[PDB]
Amino acid sequence: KKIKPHGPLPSQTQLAYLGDELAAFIHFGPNTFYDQEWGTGQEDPERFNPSQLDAREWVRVLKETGFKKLILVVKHHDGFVLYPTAHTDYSVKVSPWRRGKGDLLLEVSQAATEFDMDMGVYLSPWDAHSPLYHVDREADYNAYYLAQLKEILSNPNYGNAGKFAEVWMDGARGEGAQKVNYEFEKWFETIRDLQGDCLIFSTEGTSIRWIGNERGYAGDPLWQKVNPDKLGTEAELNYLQHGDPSGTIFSIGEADVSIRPGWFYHEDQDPKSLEELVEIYFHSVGRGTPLLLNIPPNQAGLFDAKDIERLYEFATYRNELYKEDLALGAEVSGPALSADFACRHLTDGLETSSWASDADLPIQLELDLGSPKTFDVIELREDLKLGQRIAAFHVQVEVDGVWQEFGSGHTVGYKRLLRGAVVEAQKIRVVITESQALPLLTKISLYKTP
Ligand SMILES: [Ca+2]
Numbered sequence: 044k045k046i047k048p049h050g051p052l053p054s055q056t057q058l059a060y061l062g063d064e065l066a067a068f069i070h071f072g073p074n075t076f077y078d079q080e081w082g083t084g085q086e087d088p089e090r091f092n093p094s095q096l097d098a099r100e101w102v103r104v105l106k107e108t109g110f111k112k113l114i115l116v117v118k119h120h121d122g123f124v125l126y127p128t129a130h131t132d133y134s135v136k137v138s139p140w141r142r143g144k145g146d147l148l149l150e151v152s153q154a155a156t157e158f159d160m161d162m163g164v165y166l167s168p169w170d171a172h173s174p175l176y177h178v179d180r181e182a183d184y185n186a187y188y189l190a191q192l193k194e195i196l197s198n199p200n201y202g203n204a205g206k207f208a209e210v211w212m213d214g215a216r217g218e219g220a221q222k223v224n225y226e227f228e229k230w231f232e233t234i235r236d237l238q239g240d241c242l243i244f245s246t247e248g249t250s251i252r253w254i255g256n257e258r259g260y261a262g263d264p265l266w267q268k269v270n271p272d273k274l275g276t277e278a279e280l281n282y283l284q285h286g287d288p289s290g291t292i293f294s295i296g297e298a299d300v301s302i303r304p305g306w307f308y309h310e311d312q313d314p315k316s317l318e319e320l321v322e323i324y325f326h327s328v329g330r331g332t333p334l335l336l337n338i339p340p341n342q343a344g345l346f347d348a349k350d351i352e353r354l355y356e357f358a359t360y361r362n363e364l365y366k367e368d369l370a371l372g373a374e375v376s377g378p379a380l381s382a383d384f385a386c387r388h389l390t391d392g393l394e395t396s397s398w399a400s401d402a403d404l405p406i407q408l409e410l411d412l413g414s415p416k417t418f419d420v421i422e423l424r425e426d427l428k429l430g431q432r433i434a435a436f437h438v439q440v441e442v443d444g445v446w447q448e449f450g451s452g453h454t455v456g457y458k459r460l461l462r463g464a465v466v467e468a469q470k471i472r473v474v475i476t477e478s479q480a481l482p483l484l485t486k487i488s489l490y491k492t493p
Contacts, residue, residue: 046380046399049430049480051268051293056208056240057250058427060295061267061457063111064328066163066209068299068337069101070116071147073123074307075342082121084133084171091123091138096344098147102154104346105338108354109361114163114211114335115151117195122172126201130190133172152201162202163209166191168225169216178220185226189233196237207238214246214276244297246276251295254332255283259300259323261330262286264453267431269294288434288479298327301337302350308339314353321360331456363493368392369416370471370489376409378402380481389487397426401481408473410487419465422488423455423473431456435477440468453477455484465491 053061060066073086075093105113118124124134126148135145148164155162168188170176175184192210199205212230216223227247234241243249248271254261261284268290273282286296300323303312315323327334338354340346375386377400384399386408400406421438425431437451438461449471450463471489475482 044381046384046429046481046483049432051291052430053267053293053427054240054250056242057293057295058457060112060208060242060251060333061331061427063161064333065110066112066114066161066333066335067105067110068114068116068165068301068306068335069151070119070301070306070337070339071344072116072119072125072307073121074119075339078309080305080307082119082123082171084120084122084173086121086123088123088133088135088138091135092140093340093342093344096140096147096150096340098150099154099157101338101340101346102151102158102160104351104354106158106160108358110160110336112161112163112208113151113155114165114209115148116165117148118166118170118191120167120169120171122167122170122176124166124191126195128191128194130187130194131173148195148201152203155203160203161206161208163207163211164195165211168212168214169223176217176221176223178222178224181224184223185229189226189230192230192233193237196234196241207241209242209244209251210234210238211244212246242295246274246278247271248274248292248294250293251297252278253283254296254298254327255280256298258326259298259334260326261296261298261332263330264288264434265296265330265332265456266290266454267293267295267331267427267456296332297335298323298332299335299337300327301339302353303337303339306337306339308341308347314347314350317353317356317360320353320357324357324361325460325462328458329460331454331458360493364420364490368488368490369412369418370410370421370487373410373412375487376411377407384483389484394485397483397485399481399483404476404478406475406482408475408487410471410473412469412471412489415467415469416489417465417467418489418491419463420490420492421449421461421463421471421473422486422490423459423461423484424457424486425455426483426485427457429483430480432480433475433478433482436473436475438463439472439474440466441470442466442468446472462492
């Protein structure tokens with residue numbers, strides 16, 4: 044009497060990203076030396092000349108502060124390519140950096156390989172430099188885009204031991220004779236050919252989509268699934284933000300946020316406060332989706348000291364948050380499908396195990412912590428190997444012998460962190476009120492915020 048799957052099932056790579064939670068973007072290039080956000084394609088390669096670039100420093104700090112993947116911008120809008128591409132002369136080849144022998148993608152890949160940091164790349168579809176970037180040279184431009192994809196993803200010296208985990212692309216394009224058409228499908232085919240199950244963020248129906256929110260905040264609900272016919276560059280932002288309750292492909296709505304107002308380094312900018320980073324975390328990772336956080340190196344080729352300190356503060360916040368699971372080993376009562384799907388699985392500390400029930404909704408789970416504990420966060424997780432299901436739930440707590448509401452939500456997904464006013468309680472209920480199929484949970488935890 045097995046539990047049948049519901050909805051589209053995530054790939055192993057999609058589940059890996061969801062589990063990894065945190066990725067870093069790196070914006071570094073001509074724009075850094077021109078103090079700007081968006082280049083013209085006429086920037087002087089002579090100006091690309093960082094005094095003391097240390098990619099190993101980038102990677103080491105990222106790894107130490109909890110990031111599991113690093114996506115490197117290899118060619119932004121300006122079209123300046125940060126590795127010595129065979130396919131254009133507008134690259135590091137003609138810059139003074141490393142006596143003109145530099146390869147930023149190689150230097151980051153070497154470092155990332157040493158630290159087992161997953162790798163991704165961005166090459167801007169919209170290219171302000173390339174003479175091929177015109178409606179009348181579209182086939183030519185696409186062949187150029189494709190050739191660089193091939194150049195990067197085929198070279199075993201690029202990547203984390205030759206492997207890329209995410210290719211990232213937007214869909215923006217010029218106007219008039221610059222309104223170039225992208226051969227997205229041929230690009231995705233190339234990616235799969237060269238890097239197999241590598242995730243793709245795009246505007247089309249790939250494994251990752253944009254969350255569609257500039258602040259990095261997930262919608263509520265957040266279904267990690269979509270109908271591919273409702274995406275493209277004209278996709279509705281509300282649709283990206285919530286996903287589709289009847290979506291037919293598993294899709295991660297990635298939250299992309301810069302640690303500063305701009306994506307490139309600007310001296311008169313500062314990293315987001317710990318407070319703001321914490322809010323973003325709860326509204327992204329705490330809603331079941333990864334945070335991709337941009338950190339821009341300065342003109343010296345180094346992360347800003349304020350930004351480095353902030354990442355350590357953020358890592359310390361998270362490590363303190365999760366230090367004590369106040370629900371671990373609590374007694375649970377409620378309906379359960381079988382012994383294999385017992386209530387005790389919710390707090391047993393095992394990744395092997397889950398709870399499930401086909402009882403009529405609402406389903407009530409009650410935890411007895413065994414002594415009064417002080418908390419302000421509850422975490423719930425579904426088993427997405429059987430598909431996303433829960434659509435509404437609420438949480439109640441017994442405070443001084445009287446039941447009161449703690450918080451409520453809609454989707455759970457891979458992981459939901461729900462904050463409430465701090466309480467001291469010994470008993471808690473999780474009540475599932477709506478679900479697309481019979482609910483499972485793999486874990487209920489409780490924490491106190493630092
Ligand atoms: Ca478990």
